[PDB]
Amino acid sequence: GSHMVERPPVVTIMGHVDHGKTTLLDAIRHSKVTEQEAGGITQHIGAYQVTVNDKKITFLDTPGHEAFTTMRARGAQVTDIVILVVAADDGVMPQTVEAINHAKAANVPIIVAINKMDKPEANPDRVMQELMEYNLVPEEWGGDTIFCKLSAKTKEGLDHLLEMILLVSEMEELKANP
Numbered sequence: 001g002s003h004m005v006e007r008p009p010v011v012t013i014m015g016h017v018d019h020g021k022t023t024l025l026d027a028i029r030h031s032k033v034t035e036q037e038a039g040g041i042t043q044h045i046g047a048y049q050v051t052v053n054d055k056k057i058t059f060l061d062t063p064g065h066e067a068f069t070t071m072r073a074r075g076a077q078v079t080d081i082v083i084l085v086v087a088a089d090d091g092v093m094p095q096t097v098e099a100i101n102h103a104k105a106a107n108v109p110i111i112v113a114i115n116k117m118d119k120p121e122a123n124p125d126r127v128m129q130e131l132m133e134y135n136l137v138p139e140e141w142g143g144d145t146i147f148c149k150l151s152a153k154t155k156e157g158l159d160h161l162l163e164m165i166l167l168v169s170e171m172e173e174l175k176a177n178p
């Protein structure tokens with residue numbers, strides 16, 4: 001019904017553990033936007049709305065509109081996005097797939113982020129290819145996923161990530177081919 005007009009996309013962050021499940025929600029705060037703000041990483045409530053544009057990106061989920069965390073009625077998706085975090089040093093792992101399986105189950109466009117590019121052992125395009133093995137093809141290749149090869153440790157690609165996000169946030173309406 002017409003009892004909603006503000007639409008904060010619930011960009012659920014997922015992927016494998018140790019690749020930065022919760023650490024990226026910290027890393028993301030210690031990149032910009034929130035420093036003293038009681039959100040994202042505390043205890044009362046989880047995650048937050050990041051200010052790349054104007055807080056239009058609620059990472060993970062918000063109570064009432066859970067997409068990739070839990071599907072209450074499934075159809076909580078309007079034009080939401082999922083982030084799939086894969087360490088370039090580790091790649092696709094057990095729970096990483098389960099995050100993919102949840103994503104493809106709905107068949108939502110992904111925002112992959114290959115972390116640990118701070119590591120000289122980073123193999124981004126390698127672990128990136130494992131995603132396309134679960135049929136997650138980057139838009140650099142012509143599939144349906146925006147990958148980012150970032151390092152949440154050197155705090156490089158977290159900045160580049162929100163850039164790709166805002167790109168999507170701007171094209172959100174009709175832009176994809178045009």
Ligand SMILES: Nc1nc2c(ncn2[C@@H]2O[C@H](COP(=O)(O)OP(=O)(O)O)[C@@H](O)[C@H]2O)c(=O)[nH]1
Nearest residue numbers: 017018019020021022023115116119151152153
């Ligand atoms: N090298 C590297 N390590 C990372 C990065 N992001 C997270 N980590 C590591 O991920 C580990 C697990 O993070 P934590 O939030 O405690 O665990 P999780 O939330 O269960 O994945 C941490 O000890 C970090 O060292 C990254 O971008 N690069």
